[PDB]
């Protein structure tokens, strides 16, 4: 229904806002584009699912997510992704992951302090009806 499809509408809209909310701080600008297979070669045939705050965006709008749990496993995608690709004790290595947890700590913090569960439940109640 109409009440049902501006429910994800306001998803949507909260979910460009937190994106660019991460996508806008410097730490997190190595997350913000796909990595380019110019730059980092072997990327595409070490990490099996790549994942960027572009990309997110794409989804969003494409309606890809339905639910902020959705939106999260994409978060939680891109960290986890570079905790694997970057999974040694040199500096280069160790920033990024600190970066990548930092990204999905921030992530889950501002959806714990501005997404009503109410509003998450009756997403994931019309999702599960579809």
């Not at 749990?69 to 992704?81: G, H, Q, V």
């Amino acid at each position: 229904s109409m009440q049902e499809e501006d429910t994800f509408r306001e998803l949507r809209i909260f979910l460009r806002n937190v994106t660019h909310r991460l996508a806008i701080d410097k730490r997190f600008r190595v997350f913000t584009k796909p990595v380019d297979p110019d730059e980092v070669p072997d990327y595409v045939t070490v990490i099996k699912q790549p994942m960027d705050l572009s990309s997110v965006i794409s989804k969003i709008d494409l309606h890809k997510y339905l639910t902020v749990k959705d939106y999260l496993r994409d978060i939680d995608l891109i960290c986890s992704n570079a905790l694997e690709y970057n999974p040694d004790r040199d500096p280069g290595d160790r920033l990024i992951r600190h970066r990548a947890c930092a990204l999905r700590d921030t992530a889950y913090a501002i959806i714990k302090e501005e997404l009503d569960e109410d509003f998450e439940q009756l997403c994931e109640e019309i999702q599960e009806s579809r």
